[PDB]
């Protein structure tokens, strides 16, 4: 079965930069496609970004697109979710999720399969 984690919250200063984990099961990575979600104080959970696991390419959601990038390890367990030149706004709980390629829009939550339980990260002044 496929089991996605989270990890590399915590608490980070504005404008400064930190790397998400996802790890997954297998060859979970190797089969299903990535995305990107989180969660704000309040508000709905919303995309972030999009990593198509058949050539590699990235796709961002405006929020921050040019701050924050995606990859994947050598041994493709997991996907990793760079940020750079935090702001106090990008406080939210992150979650990665997975689907099956070629299954609707990869912007939509309701096209993916499984889920992680997120991770916390708290940007302050």
Same mark, same amino acid.
């Given at each position: 079965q496929v #089991?996605? #984690?989270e990890s590399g919250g915590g608490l980070?200063?504005? =404008? /400064? @930069?930190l790397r998400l984990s996802c790890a997954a099961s297998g060859r979970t990575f190797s089969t299903y496609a990535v995305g990107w979600f989180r969660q704000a104080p309040g508000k709905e959970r919303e995309f972030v970004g999009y990593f198509g696991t058949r050539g590699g390419r990235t796709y961002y959601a405006d929020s921050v697109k040019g701050r924050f990038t995606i990859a994947i390890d050598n041994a493709? *367990?997991?996907?990793?979710? #760079?940020? *750079?030149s935090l702001k106090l706004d990008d406080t939210a709980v992150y979650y990665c999720a997975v689907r099956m390629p070629? @299954? /609707?829009?990869?912007?939509?939550? =309701?096209?993916?399969?499984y889920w992680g339980q997120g991770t916390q990260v708290t940007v302050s002044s």
């Open positions: #089991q996605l #984690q980070v200063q504005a =404008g /400064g @930069s493709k *367990n997991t996907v990793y979710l #760079q940020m *750079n070629y @299954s /609707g829009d990869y912007r939509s939550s =309701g096209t993916y399969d």
